Amino acid sequence: FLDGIDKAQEEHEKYHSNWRAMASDFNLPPVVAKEIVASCDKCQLKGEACSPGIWQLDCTHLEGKVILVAVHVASGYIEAEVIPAETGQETAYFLLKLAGRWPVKTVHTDNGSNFTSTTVKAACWWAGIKQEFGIPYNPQSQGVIESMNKELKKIIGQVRDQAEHLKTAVQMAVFIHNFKRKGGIGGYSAGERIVDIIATDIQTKELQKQITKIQNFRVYYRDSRDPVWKGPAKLLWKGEGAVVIQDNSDIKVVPRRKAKIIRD
Amino acid sequence: GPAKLLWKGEGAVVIQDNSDIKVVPRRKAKIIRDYGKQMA
Amino acid sequence: FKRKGGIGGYSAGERIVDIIATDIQTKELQKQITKIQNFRVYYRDSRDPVWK
Amino acid sequence: FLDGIDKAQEEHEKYHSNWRAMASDFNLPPVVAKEIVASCDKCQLKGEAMHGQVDCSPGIWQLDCTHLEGKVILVAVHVASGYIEAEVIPAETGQETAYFLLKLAGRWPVKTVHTDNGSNFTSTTVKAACWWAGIKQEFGIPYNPQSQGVIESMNKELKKIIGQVRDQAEHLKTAVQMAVFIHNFKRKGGIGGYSAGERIVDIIATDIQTKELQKQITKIQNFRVYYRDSRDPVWKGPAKLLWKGEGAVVIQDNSDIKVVPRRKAKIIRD
Amino acid sequence: GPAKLLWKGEGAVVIQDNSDIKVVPRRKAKIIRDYGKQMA
Amino acid sequence: CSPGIWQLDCTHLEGKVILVAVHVASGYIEAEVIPAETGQETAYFLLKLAGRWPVKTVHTDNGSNFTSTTVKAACWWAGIKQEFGVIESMNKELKKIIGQVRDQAEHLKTAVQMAVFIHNFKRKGGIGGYSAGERIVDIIATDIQNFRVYYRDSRDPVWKGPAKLLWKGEGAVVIQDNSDIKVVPRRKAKIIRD
Amino acid sequence: CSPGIWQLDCTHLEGKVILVAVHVASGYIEAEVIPAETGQETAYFLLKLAGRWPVKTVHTDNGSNFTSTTVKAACWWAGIKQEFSMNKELKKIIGQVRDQAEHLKTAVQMAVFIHNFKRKGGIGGYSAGERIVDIIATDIQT
Amino acid sequence: FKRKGGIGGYSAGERIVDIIATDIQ
DNA sequence: ACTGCTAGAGATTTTCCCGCCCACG
DNA sequence: ACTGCTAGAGATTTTCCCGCCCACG
DNA sequence: CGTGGGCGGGAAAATCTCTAGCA
């Protein structure tokens, strides 16, 4: 348990795997894996600027009727909505619906007139959503958004005989693109990828919210065969018989009788 | 709960709370792994 | 989203993720293990000597 | 304070968040989170969760008017025993209810009446009748029918037995008298298995025999108890002894019905 | 119940179940002698 | 009398500026001598008056020793409100009991020391019989020694309030909203802890 | 600590000699700056200890100004029986808020007011100015 | 061989050798 | 100053009886 | 062949912490 | 003169229970 930390350290020196691999493989607590991936030099990539809130917005006018299409670009999930009239209130209503279903963090769109209303500004102020206009987050999926729109138009050309109304065939088409399109690495249709991304993001932000209070705390400690109260070290894992800390650069374990935790 | 899962089927689920071996039907079960796993 | 509590302090939006995540994890792990582990148990029942 | 507390306050301004959500999302103690929950006046909960207690005293009697087949029925219940009387009313008015209450007071030792705030129970005629008979009038919370819920349940039970007894009689009032006779005599169970007729006899007989006997006792026995109380050395007294215990006696000094151990006490004959 | 009576007034009655002193008010008392006393 | 009322004024001994102060509840002389007509010594004396007891206000005259930016900046930094008799008596009786110690001392401020103590501790009389330094303690330290409710009106779902308590009951509470003396059950109402 | 007992100490700062007086039972300081380190100024420090606040004795160090004949005559007609950590907390607060100080004395004033009424705590979020009056209240009401 | 994940935590080589062992028989 | 309450049904625990049989007189 | 259920408030039990002081190194 | 351990006082956290309302 405690003697696998150094062989995770040399593993991160040779191959630089992330905290999940060293946590699940070596059966470690994930805090020491995040500190191993933190203490490295060349493993310090960029920040957030990954994101589960990669959302593309695109309008189209099919059969003389407005269809507003949103894409969860981090997982490739895509849906749409038939809009009767081009105004900012309809876009704000659909944006608040998307915020109600999924945690929409950032939206990417163009500088269209319908998407630049102050009603959408008040809605995103009440929501707290970063907004982008014309700027792709990364230029790989930029054409893929349009190709998915053409794919959905091919699905519409499949299922226009499956329903009478436009929006009923639209809902059947997004149901088909949610489930009836397989492939990939492990046979995921469309929902398993996005629930995997959302679950991993929820778990890593729970780890961030857990660790953001521990770094405020202090652990004054002495050792066995020692009364010299060193510290204040940083807590990693509070245990019932052994507490894990780091004083300067070493992952140490201590008895709880030798420990003293400042509450702030 | 929370019991430990032992075997899953389609109509019933075998679990173990402390030492009992309970066979709970599928319409009574709740299976989840907490994000709070990072301590325990 | 904003209302927290219930089972483990989460909103319903997290539990609806966790339920389907366990759904598309555990039965796939079970399908992967049911083709490998196949043990045949003969049992002598109670009040009797028949190995069934 | 912290900036996260202020942003949780903005969260409370926009969504009226839970205390546990603000405590988890910003690493807060729960006391200030419950204070922020109690801060905005739009966050008002559903009150307390505990039921009150209705008095069980022999001098109290409940009344209620109920309705069945387009007719009004006066129901009276002794609260301590569950003895019930019922009658059909010609017309719902205070004078006929005053006549019914005068019959009740002439037949039974009634001191206190506790009804709801209906129109017929707030007339001047029942006020003059209760002043003539010396009856303490009391009413309840203006829109809480649960303090009268005993007699509401007895309106339920008597109508259920009326459902069993309606076929034997041609009219309502004969079946009403038959049903109230059935419930006051034939229905057996409750505390000691008896009907309420034996129970109210037991209540009135025990009341008389345990007030006159203690009245005859208290003029003879008169012991004055001085007591050195706890945490103190002052010998305080004298007090009236109610009953001598084995290691602790019960007394009343001025108004406090208290227990004093006999080692901390001192009993004087006069 | 049933506790033993110790003293009675009007406002409150004091009773004893096993060793306690219960100063029960008049609105909560129930003073009845069960007429199956003919055995006990 | 408020628990924090103090009064500041001035006296000129040989054209020499001292600042006297008195609590209105007791008539309690304290004083300081300043080298020149400045405001820094006035803020010095104000927060040294606060230096052992909490001070809520200071009463002054209508002079220009209280309309400057230094003293107002100090008093609004601390939080003491400013506003521009009971001092004019004891300021006249501050120059009288020096005579037992004036010629008996090289330095006159020693006679000021002994005279201000003989005014402080050895001055009693009247009802309570205490000293003035203990009278101010008695007054302020006897001055050193209430919830809201909300309710759901019956046959309605709307909650209202807040109201003030009148009498506690185990089933219902009587309250006043502004003048509405109403009794509401505890299952339909809820009291704030504070 | 009896509520009539107080304590004195001295310090030097920016070429100016300051003197602190504390109530030992509470811990609220009061400092004052004097121009010259003379016996007159510390006898006036005994005045601004004694003439308002309920003192009984004195407590200071072995300086020759603290035990002069002027101080002894002041204690003679002031009934004071001369017998015989208070500075570091003041030296912490003065340096953070030196910026609003045209003189050192105003910095001393705002620092002792920060010590007075901006640091709430104890058993009910109290001040030291309430604790001194509670202890001398117990003295005057016992 | 140093990067894993998925349902069973497979690499690419073990997955392709499992599908080749499936495809042979 | 006022206040939810009461009759009935399985259900479950607690407890005599009887017969009996296996252990003893 | 179908089925009552769920969010919040005191209240009560269970449990760390701290300081301290009395018992000990 | 220099340390340890139980206690108690207080915080605080997990559970019990119990109710309001959905027409």
Ligand SMILES: C[C@@H]1CCO[C@H]2Cn3cc(C(=O)NCc4ccc(F)cc4F)c(=O)c(O)c3C(=O)N12
């Ligand atoms: C027109 C359909 C056709 C079928 O019958 C009606 C009548 N009804 C009545 C309620 C109601 O009384 N809810 C409160 C409630 C009370 C007690 C309880 F145990 C559970 C409870 F939910 C409904 O909620 C509701 O949806 C209907 C409804 O839809 N319909």
Ligand SMILES: [Mg+2]
């Ligand atoms: Mg009624």
Ligand SMILES: [Mg+2]
């Ligand atoms: Mg009714």
